[PDB]
């Protein structure tokens, strides 16, 4: 069961968007 309301998921698309946010600084 979902004991944590704030439980969410993370995948490769989060990585790419983050590496992009860093290149643009």
């Amino acid at each position, epitope marked *: 069961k979902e004991l944590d309301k704030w439980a969410s*998921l993370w*995948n*490769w*698309f989060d990585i*790419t*968007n983050w*590496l992009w946010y*860093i*290149r643009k600084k």
Partner: antibody
Amino acid sequence: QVQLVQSGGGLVKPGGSLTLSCVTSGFTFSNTWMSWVRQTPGKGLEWVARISRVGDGPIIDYAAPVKGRFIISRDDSRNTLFLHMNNLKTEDTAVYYCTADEGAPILRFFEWGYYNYYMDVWGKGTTVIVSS
Amino acid sequence: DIRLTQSPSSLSASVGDRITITCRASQSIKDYLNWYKHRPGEAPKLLIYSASKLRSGVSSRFSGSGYGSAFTLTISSLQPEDFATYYCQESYSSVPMYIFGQGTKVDLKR
């Protein structure tokens, strides 16, 4: 163990509509990008559409020959990928494959943000025949 | 307009042979290439992704290499379980095209 159960394929007349479904299991459906790929017997493979996680927008992309007629959607609560096909045409006759996709992030600095998109797991396919 | 041409479109070979399928590209796509296998009675299967990365589960016999506009797929020690058709797929187009090559049928030499 991962499997992609496809259904909803069969016979249909030109100009008709049909909805394909792909019930998944063995992985986190809500965290995975999905695509449809079709193959006309005698020809090669042709990417149809893709849909991302709901939280990502979702981001949806269609191939040119189907844009305006096909609609890709997903139901996370039931782990089902859909493809609503409208105004079907004889050119649409093909085997339609369900796919679970992944993205390989590019680690080169000037390519940070870009990724290689590939089809990780394919379903066994479903036949759609357009005939009068 | 990004095209992919595989060479050969069909060539023969016997069990325990070394084959090299080539995927020529109209434009430089770096390492945004992937390889798939498809047998008419089963679902297609991913072999190599991002030019030369082996997907987990595929045997070490399959190998991919190349960078730019030309690539290769090598299958050392051809096994009978892999007489099938192979496709290369690109993901470099800013427009999500995901073009596939025409395919390469691996036949039993005779």
